[PDB]
Amino acid sequence: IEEGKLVIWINGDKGYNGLAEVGKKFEKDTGIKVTVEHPDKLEEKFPQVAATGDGPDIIFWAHDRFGGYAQSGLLAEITPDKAFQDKLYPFTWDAVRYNGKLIAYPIAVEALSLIYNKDLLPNPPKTWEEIPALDKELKAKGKSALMFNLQEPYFTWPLIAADGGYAFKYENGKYDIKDVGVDNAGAKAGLTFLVDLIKNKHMNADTDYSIAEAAFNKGETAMTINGPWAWSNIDTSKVNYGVTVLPTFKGQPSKPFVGVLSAGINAASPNKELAKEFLENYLLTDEGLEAVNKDKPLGAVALKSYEEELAKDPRIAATMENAQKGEIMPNIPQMSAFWYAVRTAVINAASGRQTVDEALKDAQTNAAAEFNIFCSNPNHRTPTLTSIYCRGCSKPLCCSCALLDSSHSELKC
Ligand SMILES: OC[C@H]1O[C@H](O[C@H]2[C@H](O)[C@@H](O)[C@@H](O)O[C@@H]2CO)[C@H](O)[C@@H](O)[C@@H]1O
Ligand SMILES: [Zn+2]
Ligand SMILES: [Zn+2]
């Protein structure tokens, strides 16, 4: 890692051009060059190069992957004084706490929403159950009802979770990684409904991000499912669209996994103080987030002063409504094994390579095998085993401390 400059990694679907404009303001004020890059599969590349001290000074990703990076020692602990912490919403700071330590700067809150074409669909459906008949009526006009990414489980999880699927069982402020809900009856029903859409030719198993975005932004399909970053290309497309709450399934809301875009500092960076200055005094400002947001919308931003400007945007309102009904992703190291298992299950069930019950029993098994953790209470003289994490601080707790100790209450720790 090169001394005296900053290298930044951020996903290709984010506003990397706007962040680069923030880096040029930084360079004009300090003389420090800032290089922004968007490598492919950066969330799998970063743990690989950082383990030997390579990679960027700063990495951006949703918060769910940062706990695994921190567990492996790849992320520096950040030290914002309390005056700066008061500038961001408390909700966002919780997402970046791992093992009781803050391990990243929260940037923005993201959640999936239903996006619809107002000209084709003045009244968007409230339920998943209405989409088949709605697709039948729109094909009689040369359009389709719904196209969204079927290749990434992030997009299909809201439906799978709607009727009772879960990653890890959350109970009184705590997760239990021994209790996985990927092959239960509520997850089977949601995936079975999705596979039925493809079987009855209302959707194609092959549909990915680029195909769905192209079909919606050209006026071919009435609805898509996507996050705030996708609004930039819709806005320049000529489509007259709205953003709204995801439809219900079996009378229960779709529950999107909520992400907090977060900026982590590489443990091996010799430019940590320059990185903190960049993130605190240039990015996490009204002007800094505005430049990023004007490139690709971030969603609801963590900095209160600027979110108060964005809040009147109806698309932000819908994003927040969906976030309320969904749930914050855990940042525990087991999250990436969960995502890998669900990705395979969904793709194989949608393609007909496996039945729904085959695919999800495999996902449950493969994930559980991947899921040796010890309780964080320092008064344990010997390492005390557990499979429970506190959600607020992402600390392991044994069954004894989880029940007997008053600390780590569901409300506050
Ligand atoms: O599909 C699993 C995937 O979901 C999430 O990734 C999101 C990301 O949070 C969004 O910012 C956007 O880039 O879309 C991604 C899905 O393609 C998790 O954050 C990620 O770890 C996980 O692999
Ligand atoms: Zn304990
Ligand atoms: Zn706690």
From Swiss-Prot:
Keywords attached to this Swiss-Prot or TrEMBL record, sorted alphabetically, are: Periplasm, Signal, Sugar transport, Transport
GO MF terms here are:
carbohydrate transmembrane transporter activity; maltose binding
Q: What is the lineage of its organism?
A: Bacteria, Pseudomonadati, Pseudomonadota, Gammaproteobacteria, Enterobacterales
Record family assignment: Belongs to the bacterial solute-binding protein 1 family.
Q: What induces it?
A: Induced by maltose and the transcriptional regulator MalT. Permanently repressed by cold shock in a PNPase-dependent fashion.
- Origin species: Escherichia coli (strain K12)
* Protein name per Swiss-Prot or TrEMBL: Maltose/maltodextrin-binding periplasmic protein
Q: How does it assemble?
A: The complex is composed of two ATP-binding proteins (MalK), two transmembrane proteins (MalG and MalF) and a solute-binding protein (MalE).
The main location is: periplasm
| Subcellular compartments | Periplasm
Q: Which GO terms describe its biological process?
A: carbohydrate transport; cell chemotaxis; detection of maltose stimulus; DNA damage response; maltodextrin transmembrane transport; maltose transport
Q: Which Gene3D superfamilies match?
A: Periplasmic binding protein-like II (3.40.190.10)
State the superkingdom: Bacteria
Q: Name one GO cellular component term.
A: ATP-binding cassette (ABC) transporter complex
According to its UniProt entry, what is the function of this protein? Answer: Part of the ABC transporter complex MalEFGK involved in maltose/maltodextrin import. Binds maltose and higher maltodextrins such as maltotriose.
